[PDB]
């Protein structure tokens with residue numbers, strides 16, 4: 001057992017409770033719109049959980065040579081994010097009745113963001129790793145921009161209950177998402193300042209808040225109906 005296993009086991013559990021809790025709740029609703037929010041928001045933690053459980057069994061980890069040592073890299077995150085991040089975005093988009101072309105672009109951006117962050121994490125030349133990280137972040141700030149400006153202004157043209165739920169969900173997403181690039185920069189994938197075990201703790205906290213925490217705020221609100 002690697003020092004960080006405690007945090008993988010604790011994400012596993014929390015994603016697990018979150019997935020089943022949402023599954024149940026959503027299975028009892030008959031409203032066709034609420035069902036759609038549920039399927040999507042249940043699928044996120046579902047994908048998370050199977051990927052955290054994978055990591056807890058020691059898969060999804062490779063050694064990458066850079067700055068003269070063998071650094072450990074949990075590529076399994078990216079497998080998870082790749083599919084979970086668009087899923088969250090989609091929620092926000094359904095919520096504000098956003099245009100088809102906005103969604104494609106956001107997903108577009110998102111693929112870019114995760115794609116590059118991964119290549120970042122696998123690059124053997126130390127310098128270049130930061131070239132990818134900076135592209136990934138650029139792609140991300142593009143996303144947040146559109147959420148904050150684009151989506152909010154769409155939210156205005158909906159009921160107060162829907163708009164004010166979006167805002168909460170918007171704020172939560174802007175706080176968590178903007179932590180990730182910093183964690184990566186200071187963690188084992190970047191500067192190797194914060195060790196792997198603490199890096200995992202921070203990602204789990206962010207992973208869980210952003211899927212269990214989000215789902216809970218969204219799924220309890222009248223605005224899904």
Ligand SMILES: *C/C=C(C)/C=C/C=C(C)/C=C/C1=C(C)CCCC1(C)C
Pocket residue numbers: 081084085088113114117118133136137140177178180181184207210211
């Ligand atoms: C459920 C998982 C969520 C909601 C994760 C979001 C992850 C990001 C917003 C990742 C951003 C990254 C950068 C901005 C550059 C560095 C590497 C990435 C993946 C960590």
